[PDB]
C-alpha cells in the first residue's frame, strides 16, 4: 500500500526532481537525474501519446505518494465537485494532511511527514489524527504533539522548510509549531510544472 | 575412524538389510533365517572392514529378529554418517571438464544427494542433453554429455541393472573433415538421482561408460 522502493529512481524516470529527498545535498550530486533508471536508461525512446499522459499522472502520484485506487477516487470527486476538474484534483491532494505537514515544514519530506502523522505525533484542531488522507479544512489549526515537539527531526525539518519557498495559504509559527490553513491553495499558487489537463484526459480515456 | 563406505556400497547395505527384515517376516523357518542372518552379518562386516562398537551394536540389532524399520532407519542414518559424499569440482574445473560446452552451468545438488550418489548427472531439457560427471578409477573427474530420447519406456536400466523408466542415451564420437561420426548408446534412467540410489556397484557404472566409449 506504500512504495518503499528507492526514491531517486522515481525522479530519474520522470526526468525532474520529485522532491523525495531532504535537499540538504543537490539531487544531481546524489544521483544521475538526467539518465532514466535501468541498463537501457541512457537510451531515450520517443514518448507515445498514452505515455505522455501516463507519465504526468505518475509524476503527481509520486510527488504526493498516493496510490492509483486512491488517486482514481480523487479524480472522480474532482469531477463531481463543480469547477475545473484538474484544479479541484490538485487542491484535494494539497488538502491531504501529509502534504500540509510537509508544507508547514514539520516534516523534511512528505514521507517523513507521513511517519509523524502515522505515529500520532500530529494533532489537528486538538484531536490526534493518524490519517494521511485526512483533508484539512480552511481555518483548521495543525500543531505537533508536545511529546513530539522534543523530537530533533521536526526542528531540523523546520530549518529545511526555511530554505524552501513558503506557501501563502499556510501560516506557520516556529517554536509553537502550529499552522492554520487559511485558504485552499490556488492552482496558480500550486506548481506550474504539473499539468492537470493530461491527468484528466488519461482518466477520461 | 568411521569406515569410508562408498555410496554404492551404502545402497547395497540398505538393500540387504531390507531383505533381512523381509526375511524375518517372510520366513517361517528359523534355520533359513539363521543362514540369512549369518550371511548378512558377514556381508556387512566385509563392506565395513573393521567394525566399531556402533556398527557391532547395529549389526546386533540387525541380527535380532525383533529388528524394526524405525531401528533400521536409525541404523541407516548411522551408516549414512560413515558414507562420504560425492566430491563437487570448482566451477573453473567444470568448464575444463566441458570446454566444448561454452558457459556450461551446473544446477545446485543436495549434499545428501552427493552422499547417496556415486556419480552426478544433470540433464538440460532444451538441448535434450544429459551431462554425467564421475571420478574414474584413478579418481580423475570424467564428464560425458549425451543426447537423451524424449520418448520414455519401461525397461531394465543398464546403469543400475534395475527396471525403471529409461530413455536412450547416445554419445557422439569426434566428427572429422568428412563429417563422419558414430553415436553409441543404451537405455538409461531419465532421473540420475533415482539411478544413483538404485546403483549398488560402481563397477557396473564404470562398465556402462566403457560401453558408451
Amino acid at each position: 500500500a506504500r512504495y518503499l522502493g528507492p526514491k531517486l529512481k522515481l525522479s530519474r524516470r520522470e526526468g525532474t526532481d520529485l522532491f523525495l529527498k531532504s535537499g540538504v545535498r543537490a539531487i544531481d550530486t546524489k544521483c544521475k537525474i538526467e539518465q532514466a533508471p535501468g541498463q537501457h536508461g541512457a537510451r531515450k525512446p520517443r514518448l507515445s501519446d498514452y505515455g505522455v499522459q501516463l507519465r504526468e499522472k505518475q509524476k503527481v502520484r509520486r510527488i504526493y505518494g498516493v496510490l492509483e485506487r486512491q488517486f482514481r477516487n480523487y479524480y472522480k470527486e474532482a469531477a463531481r465537485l463543480k469547477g475545473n476538474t484538474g484544479e479541484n484534483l490538485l487542491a484535494l491532494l494539497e488538502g491531504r494532511l501529509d502534504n500540509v505537514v510537509y508544507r508547514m515544514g514539520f516534516g523534511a519530506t512528505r514521507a517523513e511527514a507521513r511517519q509523524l502523522v502515522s505515529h500520532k505525533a500530529i494533532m489537528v484542531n486538538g484531536r490526534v489524527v493518524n490519517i494521511a488522507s485526512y483533508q484539512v479544512s480552511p481555518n483548521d489549526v495543525v500543531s505537533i504533539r508536545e511529546k513530539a515537539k522534543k523530537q530533533s527531526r521536526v526542528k531540523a525539518a523546520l530549518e529545511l522548510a526555511e530554505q524552501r519557498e513558503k506557501p501563502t495559504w499556510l501560516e506557520v509559527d516556529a517554536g509553537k509549531m502550529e499552522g492554520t490553513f487559511k485558504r485552499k491553495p490556488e492552482r496558480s499558487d500550486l506548481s506550474a510544472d504539473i499539468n492537470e489537463h493530461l491527468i484528466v484526459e488519461l482518466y477520461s480515456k | 575412524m568411521k569406515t569410508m563406505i562408498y555410496p554404492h556400497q551404502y545402497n547395497y547395505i540398505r538393500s540387504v538389510i531390507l531383505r533381512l527384515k523381509n526375511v524375518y517376516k517372510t520366513v517361517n523357518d528359523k534355520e533359513t533365517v539363521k543362514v540369512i542372518q549369518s550371511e548378512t552379518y558377514n556381508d556387512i562386516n566385509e563392506i565395513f572392514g573393521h567394525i566399531d562398537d556402533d556398527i557391532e551394536e547395529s549389526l546386533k540389532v540387525l541380527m535380532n529378529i525383533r529388528l524394526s524399520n524405525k531401528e533400521i532407519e536409525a541404523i541407516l542414518n548411522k551408516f549414512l554418517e560413515y558414507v562420504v559424499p560425492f566430491e563437487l569440482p570448482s566451477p573453473q574445473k567444470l568448464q575444463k571438464v566441458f570446454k566444448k560446452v561454452k558457459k556450461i552451468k551446473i544446477p545446485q545438488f543436495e549434499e545428501y544427494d552427493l552422499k547417496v550418489s556415486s556419480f552426478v548427472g544433470w540433464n538440460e531439457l532444451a538441448s535434450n542433453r544429459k551431462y554425467i560427471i564421475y571420478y574414474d578409477e584413478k579418481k580423475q573427474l570424467k564428464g560425458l554429455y549425451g543426447e537423451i530420447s524424449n520418448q520414455v519406456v519401461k525397461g531394465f536400466c543398464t546403469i543400475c541393472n534395475k527396471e525403471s523408466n529409461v530413455s536412450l542415451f547416445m554419445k557422439k564420437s569426434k566428427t572429422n573433415s568428412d563429417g563422419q561420426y558414430v553415436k553409441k548408446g543404451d537405455y538409461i534412467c531419465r532421473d540420475s538421482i533415482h539411478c544413483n540410489k538404485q546403483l549398488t556397484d560402481i563397477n557396473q557404472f564404470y562398465n556402462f561408460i566403457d560401453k558408451l566409449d
Binding site: - | 517361517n28 534355520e31 533359513t32 525397461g155 531394465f156 536412450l168 568428412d178 563422419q180 558414430v182 553409441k184
Partner: protein, 647 residues
C-alpha cells in the same frame, strides 16, 4: 465394567482349527463371571495375515486354537510369530477332541518341537474322540465332567484314580514350567512346599502376561466341552488393559517426543482406528480401540494422523448378533463409531486439543502383481471406482494403470487375495474383467546383417544403410559413413531421427529394437527435390526393408535367481526351475542350507514365491537380479506377435 475386569482378546488359529466355532460357543456361553470380554476374530488363512497382524496390534491377549488331530500347523507358526513380534500374551486351546485321531499329548509336543514355546498343560483330557467326556484341572486338582451335549451341565468330581497319578505328574510338570519364571514358585517347588491354587494362578498369570509361559487347555467347541474353562482361563491368566504395557505414541508437533498413553478414563482421549467396514444399515463403520480417556456420542474428535476434525454421530457396541448403541466409550474398550468420514485404518483419534499420534500399522508391499482388463469401457470406469473403494478398505491392495500399455495392474499379498478382490469387483460392482499375468517388457533385435536401400520419391530422399547385429547389451550404434557429400550433412540428422523413431516402435510386435548397428554408407539427393522429411521417411523405409531381411527376433528378460533352501527340498526346486525354462548354473552348500544359482525368464518367475513356499514348505527363499535379454522361443514369440498385432 472396570478396567481391571476388562479383557480384550483375539482368536488365532490355522485353517479348519474350529476357530470360528470356538468364538460362537464363547458368545453362546456369555460378559463372563462379572468380567467384560471383547473378542476380535482373526483370519486363519495365510493370505489374510495382514488382518491378523492389525488385530494383534490392538489386542491385549490372544487365544491360540489348535486341532487336537493336527497340532501346530504352518499357519499356526506364522500367527504365533506375529503375536511374538507384538509381544501379545496368549493361551493355547486344544480343539476337536472329538475328532477321530485326537491326541492332546501330541499337540502339546508339537508346540515344543515347532514353536519351542514354554507351554505346559493346565488341563488334562479324560478320553479321546468319542470317549472324551471330562477334563482334569491341574491347578485345582479337580475333574469336570460334561453330562450333556449342550455343555450347560458341568459336574465337578474327584480326579479318577486311573488319572490321579497322571494328574499329579502333570501338575508337577506345570509347576516346574511356571517355577522357571517365578522365584517364589521355584523355591516352593524345590522345597516340595504346598503351592495354593491362588498362588499358582497368580504365578501363571504373571508368566503369561510376561509372555514367558503359555497355559495349554483342551476341549471341543463342537461338543460344547472346555469352552467355559477356556473363558475362565482368559479371565484368570490373560491381562487387562491395566496389566499390559501402555501404548507409546508421538506428538504430531514433535515426532521425537514419545508420549505414553496409559489406560485411564480421566486422561486425555486417545484412540486408534484398526478396522473400517461398509455396512448397509449404518453406512461406514470405523472400529477403534480407546487407549486413554473417554469419548461421548455426538462429540467432536481430531484425527491426529490427518489433522482433520471429525464428529462421531453414534457409538456402536457389538453384542454377538445383536448391536447396542452406547453413549460413552471408555479407556481399554473397543467399539465402532458412525460418521467418521475421513478416519481410515491405522489413524489415531484424540481430543481436539490433543495431538498424540499412536504407532500406526505398517502395511507390506504387494508380493503378487496381475493385469486386469475390463471387457467394456463402461466396466473400466466401474472398475476404477471399485478398485479405489477396495484400496481404501485394504491398503495392502495396490491397483494402478500402466500408462504405457494401458493395462490395469493389481498387486496383492496372495493369489487368493487378488482372486477375492477380482471376485468382489465382479459380484459387488458388477464389473466384467479378464485377469492375467502382466505382460513382461520385451525388446526386439536382429540376428543377421543386411544392406538395404530406402528410397522416397518433387520430394526426394535416398539412403543406403547397412544393419548389423550388435553384441548382447552393446546397445544401439549409428555410424555416418557418407563420403563426398552423397547425402547433404543437413539431412543426416533427419535420417538419424527417422531411424530412431522407427527403432523405438519396433518391427515385429512393436517393441523397441536394441543391440543393432546401423551404418549409413551411401545415398542420393536432388538439389531442388530433396527435403528433411523425405530423408526421414527414406530412413524409416530402410528399417522396414531391413526387418524383412535381417531375421528379427523377440527378446525376453533373463533373471539370475539365487535360491536358498534345505537340501531335502533341493530335488523339488531343481525340477521346478527346469519346468520354468530355467537353467541351473551352480549349487553350493551353506551351513544346513543349500544355495542354488539359476537363470530363469522373468515371464516364468511370476508366482514363483508361492511355488517355492509350497515346494519347500515355506523353508526356502530366493533373490533375483536382471542378467541379460535372451531370445524367446518361436512358439512364444508367435503368441506375442499375435497378441500385439491383434491376431
Amino acid at each position: 465394567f472396570s478396567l481391571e475386569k476388562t479383557r480384550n482378546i483375539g482368536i488365532m488359529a490355522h485353517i479348519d482349527a474350529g476357530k470360528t466355532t470356538t468364538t460362537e460357543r464363547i458368545l453362546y456361553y456369555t460378559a463372563w463371571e462379572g468380567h467384560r470380554v471383547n473378542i476380535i476374530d482373526t483370519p486363519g488363512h495365510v493370505d489374510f495375515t495382514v488382518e491378523v497382524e492389525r488385530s494383534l496390534r490392538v489386542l491385549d491377549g490372544a487365544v491360540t486354537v489348535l486341532d487336537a488331530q493336527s497340532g501346530v500347523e504352518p499357519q499356526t507358526e506364522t500367527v504365533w510369530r506375529q503375536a511374538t513380534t507384538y509381544g501379545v500374551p496368549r493361551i493355547v486351546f486344544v480343539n476337536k477332541m472329538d475328532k477321530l485321531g485326537a491326541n492332546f499329548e501330541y499337540s502339546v509336543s508339537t508346540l515344543h518341537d515347532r514353536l519351542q514355546a514354554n507351554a505346559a498343560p493346565i488341563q488334562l483330557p479324560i478320553g479321546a474322540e468319542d470317549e472324551f467326556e471330562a477334563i482334569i484341572d491341574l491347578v485345582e486338582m479337580k475333574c469336570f465332567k460334561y453330562t450333556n451335549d449342550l455343555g450347560t451341565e458341568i459336574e465337578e468330581i474327584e480326579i479318577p484314580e486311573d488319572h490321579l497319578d497322571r494328574a499329579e505328574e502333570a501338575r508337577a510338570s506345570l509347576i516346574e514350567a511356571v517355577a522357571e519364571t517365578s522365584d517364589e514358585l521355584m523355591e516352593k517347588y524345590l522345597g516340595d512346599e504346598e503351592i495354593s491354587v491362588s498362588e499358582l494362578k497368580e504365578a501363571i498369570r504373571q508368566a503369561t502376561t510376561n509372555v514367558e509361559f503359555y497355559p495349554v487347555l483342551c476341549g471341543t467347541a463342537f461338543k460344547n466341552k472346555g469352552v467355559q474353562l477356556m473363558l475362565d482361563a482368559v479371565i484368570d491368566y490373560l491381562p487387562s488393559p491395566l496389566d499390559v504395557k501402555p501404548i507409546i505414541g508421538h506428538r504430531a508437533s514433535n515426532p521425537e517426543e514419545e508420549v505414553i498413553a496409559k489406560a485411564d478414563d480421566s486422561a486425555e482421549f486417545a484412540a486408534l482406528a484398526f478396522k473400517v467396514m461398509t455396512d448397509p444399515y449404518v453406512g461406514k463403520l470405523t472400529f477403534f480401540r480407546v487407549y486413554s480417556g473417554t469419548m461421548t456420542s455426538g462429540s467432536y474428535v481430531k484425527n491426529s494422523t490427518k489433522g482433520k476434525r471429525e464428529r462421531v454421530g453414534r457409538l456402536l457396541q457389538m453384542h454377538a448378533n445383536s448391536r447396542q448403541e452406547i453413549d460413552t466409550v471408555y479407556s481399554g474398550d473397543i467399539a465402532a463409531a458412525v460418521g467418521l468420514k475421513d478416519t481410515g485404518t491405522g489413524d489415531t483419534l484424540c481430543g481436539e486439543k490433543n495431538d498424540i499420534i499412536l504407532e500406526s500399522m505398517e502395511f507390506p508391499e504387494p508380493v503378487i502383481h496381475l493385469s486386469v482388463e475390463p471387457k467394456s469401457k463402461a466396466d473400466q470406469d466401474k472398475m476404477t471406482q471399485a478398485l479405489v473403494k477396495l484400496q481404501e478398505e485394504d491398503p495392502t491392495f495396490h491397483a494402478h494403470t500402466d500408462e504405457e500399455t494401458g493395462q490395469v495392474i493389481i498387486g496383492g499379498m496372495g493369489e487368493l487375495h487378488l482372486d477375492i478382490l477380482v471376485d468382489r469387483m465382479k459380484k459387488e460392482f458388477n464389473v466384467e474383467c479378464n485377469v492375467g499375468a502382466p505382460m513382461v517388457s520385451y525388446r526386439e533385435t536382429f540376428k543377421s546383417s543386411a544392406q538395404v536401400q530406402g528410397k522416397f520419391s518433387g520430394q526426394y530422399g535416398d539412403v543406403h544403410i547397412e544393419f548389423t547385429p550388435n553384441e548382447t547389451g552393446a546397445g544401439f550404434e549409428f555410424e555416418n559413413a557418407i563420403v563426398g557429400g552423397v547425402v547433404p550433412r543437413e539431412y543426416i540428422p533427419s535420417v538419424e531421427a527417422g531411424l530412431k523413431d522407427a527403432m523405438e516402435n519396433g518391427v515385429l510386435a512393436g517393441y523397441p529394437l536394441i543391440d543393432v548397428k546401423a551404418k549409413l554408407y551411401d545415398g542420393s539427393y536432388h538439389d531442388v527435390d530433396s527435403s528433411e522429411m523425405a530423408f526421414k521417411i527414406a530412413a524409416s523405409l530402410a528399417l522396414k526393408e531391413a526387418a524383412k531381411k535381417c531375421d528379427p527376433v523377440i527378446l525376453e528378460p533373463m533373471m539370475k535367481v539365487t535360491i536358498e533352501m534345505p537340501e531335502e527340498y533341493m530335488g523339488d526346486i531343481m525340477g521346478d526351475v527346469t519346468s520354468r525354462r530355467g537353467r541351473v548354473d551352480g549349487m553350493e552348500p551353506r551351513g544346513n542350507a543349500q544355495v542354488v544359482n539359476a537363470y530363469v525368464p522373468l515371464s516364468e518367475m511370476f508366482g514363483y514365491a508361492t511355488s517355492l513356499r509350497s515346494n519347500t514348505q515355506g523353508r526356502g527363499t530366493y533373490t533375483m537380479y536382471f542378467d541379460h535379454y535372451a531370445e524367446v522361443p518361436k512358439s512364444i514369440a508367435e503368441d506375442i506377435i499375435k497378441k500385439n498385432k491383434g491376431e
